[PDB]
Amino acid sequence: HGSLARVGKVRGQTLKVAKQEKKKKRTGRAKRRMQYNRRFVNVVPTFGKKKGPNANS
Amino acid sequence: TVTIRTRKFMTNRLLQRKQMVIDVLHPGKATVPKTEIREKLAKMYKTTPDVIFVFGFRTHFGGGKTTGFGMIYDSLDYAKKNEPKHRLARHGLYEKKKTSRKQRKERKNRMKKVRGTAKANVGA
Amino acid sequence: PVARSWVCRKTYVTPRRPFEKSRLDQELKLIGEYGLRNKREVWRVKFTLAKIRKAARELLTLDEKDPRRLFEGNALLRRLVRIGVLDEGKMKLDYILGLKIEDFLERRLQTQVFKLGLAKSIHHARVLIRQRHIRVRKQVVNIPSFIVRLDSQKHIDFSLRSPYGGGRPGRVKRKNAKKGQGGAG
Amino acid sequence: GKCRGLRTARKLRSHRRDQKWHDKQYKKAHLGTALKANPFGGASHAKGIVLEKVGVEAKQPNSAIRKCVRVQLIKNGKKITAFVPNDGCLNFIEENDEVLVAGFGRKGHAVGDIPGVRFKVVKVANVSLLALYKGKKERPR
RNA sequence: GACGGGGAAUCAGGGUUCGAUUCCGGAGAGGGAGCCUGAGAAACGGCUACCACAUCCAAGGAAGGCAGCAGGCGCGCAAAUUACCCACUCCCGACCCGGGGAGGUAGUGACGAAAAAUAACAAUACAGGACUCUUUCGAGGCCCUGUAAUUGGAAUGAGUCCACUUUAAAUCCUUUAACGAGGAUCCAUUGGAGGGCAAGUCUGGUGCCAGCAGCCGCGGUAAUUCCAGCUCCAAUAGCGUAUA
């Protein structure tokens, strides 16, 4: 407990996890090429409502 | 295989020199220095390789071409008379006193502080 | 009082709507099909097309048989037919407005190398141009946004100082050859 | 317009000038009172020394309090009240320390649920609050 | 919170705002005042007195005006080297020869503008796709499209570095030999992900607390908005914030 309005309480008692070592991301011309490919030539004709890029329902 | 083609050739009786624009073709190598240009212009124009004064060589983007200026003088006296001093210093017949502007200005002010014969004495 | 120029201008205009859908769709389609790097290039081509269209509109609001109209309109028409976006059968003042962004982006050096038949893809074409491999009339070009003319299209080939058009090999060929000489010797 | 005569320009100009002065944004933007009452004095940022820390409360829709400091500027001597933006950034500030205050978003207007506060703290002890909050720089000891 | 103008930003059409600032004209060298010389000055890198400020001194006296070029103090949110040269542009003088912080050169420089790296290709991996069929299986997959840290050979550039060029002498650019990339660690950031407004009814923690929020509003012990991880979105060597 301590006090109600403690300055920096939630960020102070937040759990601390580390970053995961991952492969680097392409940037520049190849990023737009990958975006164009994934958005326009890997698509299938579907119906209803189009799924979002981050949809995880 | 370094060839030289001339351009805009025009002679002056009033300057006793011939101005022209030099186009140098050196494909596959670096920029050629000016002294082989001087001997090659001496060979093609049948002149001694000491009155030819060249400068301003810029290499085009890509490599292979170089455009610059060059003059051919009649004799050494005309080459010594109407020329800038830095080209003569580049060819090695003129040299200047090794003093900066700050020393000259301070010596001039210190000489201005006094009057008379001692003006030369204070200037050392 | 210094001897400078102080003359410069922007070559692009940002759109009014920052987050739209269809506009971003055709911009992404143009970037992916022409192998561009960012939206600044397609906005620049759109800006210069808009300037040409604005000049054509303000000359088309004018009346006929005006000598300055005939003069700088013929100047604009000869520029547009010498750049490669217009034809001789459409040498008219209204046919400038029927132009597209495809016509201006098709005279880019990248797609000209890609459609000429010496590059595998358009990104490979940009890599090939950027690494000093081609030349246009005895002069190499280091950049992909070199908008060619109609009279200079048939002169594009590989540069002399390149391993593709006949010349000294690169560094990995020589390094692997030296490694092979060391292993065999 | 109302005057449609060919020789009616002085009347139209005078009426437009009077109705332009009889406005709001042109009225604050052309007198010296609205800029004289501004503690910044027509400036984007200002410096001053923090005297104390006050916990100002929110409005009636929501129940929280806002951590805030009081600043006495040096350019004019006025005393202002500036909000420390982020979470836990009040602990980087102590008494008798200099800060760089700025506007808070709506050009001299209370933003959100904080009453009577029109300024925010950008930098403290000649380093930004964002660098201290993200753990990039450190307070000089 | 006025030097004026030529002009600048925005701009269907009209309009609004700015113009201390390299060109032209005017004014001043702390502020007023008076004057010598000279063709031309009420001159201040000329003089004479006042006040304010101010330097040295054996204390009788003497000497000043960086709103010039560098640099310093104070001030404020706010602005660079106590460098080199008369070679280029011109100017003054008895004068082809001397001088010029006028000027030119480099340093500092993310005010801003233009161009433009951070990857491409090939065979397997495996999701589909067009052509008569196999109705719906396999295949021709010869012709593709795409990405998985599967693999191998070609490439050019930053940076180090003979030289050459440039230059008053250099430096920068260009040219050019010797080196110089596989997770090519030679590793691209800035703001977001409820609506406005492109983009997770994901996971864990606090629980009207901490805080987010330009505006609606979000947090009350199952948060799409807080605090962290994953994923995604907008621009890209650029992005966000505050004031006219």
PDB file of N, CA, C and O in Angstrom, chain C residues 137-159:
ATOM      1  N   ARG C 137      25.476   7.353 -74.102  1.00  0.00           N
ATOM      2  CA  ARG C 137      26.230   8.118 -75.104  1.00  0.00           C
ATOM      3  C   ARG C 137      27.596   8.537 -74.537  1.00  0.00           C
ATOM      4  O   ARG C 137      27.873   9.707 -74.249  1.00  0.00           O
ATOM      5  N   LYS C 138      28.417   7.498 -74.311  1.00  0.00           N
ATOM      6  CA  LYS C 138      29.804   7.607 -73.825  1.00  0.00           C
ATOM      7  C   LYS C 138      29.899   8.346 -72.490  1.00  0.00           C
ATOM      8  O   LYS C 138      30.844   9.098 -72.243  1.00  0.00           O
ATOM      9  N   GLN C 139      28.914   8.132 -71.620  1.00  0.00           N
ATOM     10  CA  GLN C 139      28.879   8.812 -70.327  1.00  0.00           C
ATOM     11  C   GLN C 139      28.080   7.958 -69.359  1.00  0.00           C
ATOM     12  O   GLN C 139      26.894   7.708 -69.595  1.00  0.00           O
ATOM     13  N   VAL C 140      28.720   7.516 -68.275  1.00  0.00           N
ATOM     14  CA  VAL C 140      28.044   6.658 -67.310  1.00  0.00           C
ATOM     15  C   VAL C 140      27.081   7.484 -66.462  1.00  0.00           C
ATOM     16  O   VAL C 140      27.248   8.699 -66.283  1.00  0.00           O
ATOM     17  N   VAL C 141      26.037   6.822 -65.966  1.00  0.00           N
ATOM     18  CA  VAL C 141      25.016   7.447 -65.134  1.00  0.00           C
ATOM     19  C   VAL C 141      24.935   6.668 -63.829  1.00  0.00           C
ATOM     20  O   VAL C 141      24.773   5.442 -63.840  1.00  0.00           O
ATOM     21  N   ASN C 142      25.046   7.379 -62.707  1.00  0.00           N
ATOM     22  CA  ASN C 142      25.090   6.769 -61.385  1.00  0.00           C
ATOM     23  C   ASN C 142      23.723   6.787 -60.701  1.00  0.00           C
ATOM     24  O   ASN C 142      23.587   6.288 -59.579  1.00  0.00           O
ATOM     25  N   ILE C 143      22.702   7.335 -61.355  1.00  0.00           N
ATOM     26  CA  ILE C 143      21.408   7.586 -60.719  1.00  0.00           C
ATOM     27  C   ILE C 143      20.263   6.970 -61.522  1.00  0.00           C
ATOM     28  O   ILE C 143      20.343   6.882 -62.757  1.00  0.00           O
ATOM     29  N   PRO C 144      19.179   6.526 -60.873  1.00  0.00           N
ATOM     30  CA  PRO C 144      18.076   5.914 -61.630  1.00  0.00           C
ATOM     31  C   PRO C 144      17.066   6.900 -62.192  1.00  0.00           C
ATOM     32  O   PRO C 144      16.353   6.542 -63.139  1.00  0.00           O
ATOM     33  N   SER C 145      16.970   8.113 -61.655  1.00  0.00           N
ATOM     34  CA  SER C 145      15.977   9.083 -62.125  1.00  0.00           C
ATOM     35  C   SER C 145      16.529   9.962 -63.243  1.00  0.00           C
ATOM     36  O   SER C 145      16.518  11.189 -63.162  1.00  0.00           O
ATOM     37  N   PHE C 146      17.014   9.325 -64.303  1.00  0.00           N
ATOM     38  CA  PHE C 146      17.544  10.016 -65.472  1.00  0.00           C
ATOM     39  C   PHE C 146      16.505   9.900 -66.581  1.00  0.00           C
ATOM     40  O   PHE C 146      16.445   8.884 -67.280  1.00  0.00           O
ATOM     41  N   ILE C 147      15.687  10.935 -66.740  1.00  0.00           N
ATOM     42  CA  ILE C 147      14.573  10.891 -67.681  1.00  0.00           C
ATOM     43  C   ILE C 147      15.138  11.075 -69.087  1.00  0.00           C
ATOM     44  O   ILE C 147      15.582  12.167 -69.452  1.00  0.00           O
ATOM     45  N   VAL C 148      15.127  10.001 -69.875  1.00  0.00           N
ATOM     46  CA  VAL C 148      15.782   9.974 -71.178  1.00  0.00           C
ATOM     47  C   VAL C 148      14.927  10.677 -72.223  1.00  0.00           C
ATOM     48  O   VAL C 148      13.751  10.976 -71.986  1.00  0.00           O
ATOM     49  N   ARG C 149      15.516  10.944 -73.384  1.00  0.00           N
ATOM     50  CA  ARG C 149      14.832  11.568 -74.506  1.00  0.00           C
ATOM     51  C   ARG C 149      14.511  10.524 -75.567  1.00  0.00           C
ATOM     52  O   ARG C 149      14.905   9.359 -75.474  1.00  0.00           O
ATOM     53  N   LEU C 150      13.775  10.964 -76.590  1.00  0.00           N
ATOM     54  CA  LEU C 150      13.406  10.067 -77.680  1.00  0.00           C
ATOM     55  C   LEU C 150      14.595   9.758 -78.582  1.00  0.00           C
ATOM     56  O   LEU C 150      14.677   8.660 -79.145  1.00  0.00           O
ATOM     57  N   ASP C 151      15.526  10.699 -78.723  1.00  0.00           N
ATOM     58  CA  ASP C 151      16.681  10.537 -79.595  1.00  0.00           C
ATOM     59  C   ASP C 151      17.868   9.886 -78.897  1.00  0.00           C
ATOM     60  O   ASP C 151      18.918   9.710 -79.523  1.00  0.00           O
ATOM     61  N   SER C 152      17.729   9.525 -77.619  1.00  0.00           N
ATOM     62  CA  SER C 152      18.821   8.922 -76.867  1.00  0.00           C
ATOM     63  C   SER C 152      18.465   7.549 -76.307  1.00  0.00           C
ATOM     64  O   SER C 152      19.201   7.031 -75.459  1.00  0.00           O
ATOM     65  N   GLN C 153      17.364   6.948 -76.755  1.00  0.00           N
ATOM     66  CA  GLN C 153      16.938   5.649 -76.247  1.00  0.00           C
ATOM     67  C   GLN C 153      17.761   4.495 -76.802  1.00  0.00           C
ATOM     68  O   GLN C 153      18.009   3.519 -76.083  1.00  0.00           O
ATOM     69  N   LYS C 154      18.206   4.588 -78.054  1.00  0.00           N
ATOM     70  CA  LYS C 154      18.893   3.495 -78.730  1.00  0.00           C
ATOM     71  C   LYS C 154      20.398   3.481 -78.477  1.00  0.00           C
ATOM     72  O   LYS C 154      21.119   2.749 -79.167  1.00  0.00           O
ATOM     73  N   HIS C 155      20.890   4.261 -77.516  1.00  0.00           N
ATOM     74  CA  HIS C 155      22.313   4.327 -77.223  1.00  0.00           C
ATOM     75  C   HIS C 155      22.671   3.771 -75.852  1.00  0.00           C
ATOM     76  O   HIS C 155      23.831   3.885 -75.439  1.00  0.00           O
ATOM     77  N   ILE C 156      21.720   3.177 -75.138  1.00  0.00           N
ATOM     78  CA  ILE C 156      21.969   2.680 -73.789  1.00  0.00           C
ATOM     79  C   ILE C 156      22.581   1.287 -73.874  1.00  0.00           C
ATOM     80  O   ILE C 156      21.990   0.371 -74.455  1.00  0.00           O
ATOM     81  N   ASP C 157      23.769   1.127 -73.294  1.00  0.00           N
ATOM     82  CA  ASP C 157      24.440  -0.162 -73.208  1.00  0.00           C
ATOM     83  C   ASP C 157      25.261  -0.215 -71.922  1.00  0.00           C
ATOM     84  O   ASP C 157      25.244   0.717 -71.112  1.00  0.00           O
ATOM     85  N   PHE C 158      25.979  -1.318 -71.737  1.00  0.00           N
ATOM     86  CA  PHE C 158      26.838  -1.467 -70.571  1.00  0.00           C
ATOM     87  C   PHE C 158      28.076  -0.586 -70.698  1.00  0.00           C
ATOM     88  O   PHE C 158      28.584  -0.341 -71.794  1.00  0.00           O
ATOM     89  N   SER C 159      28.556  -0.103 -69.554  1.00  0.00           N
ATOM     90  CA  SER C 159      29.745   0.737 -69.534  1.00  0.00           C
ATOM     91  C   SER C 159      30.997  -0.094 -69.792  1.00  0.00           C
ATOM     92  O   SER C 159      31.007  -1.316 -69.625  1.00  0.00           O
TER      93      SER C 159
END
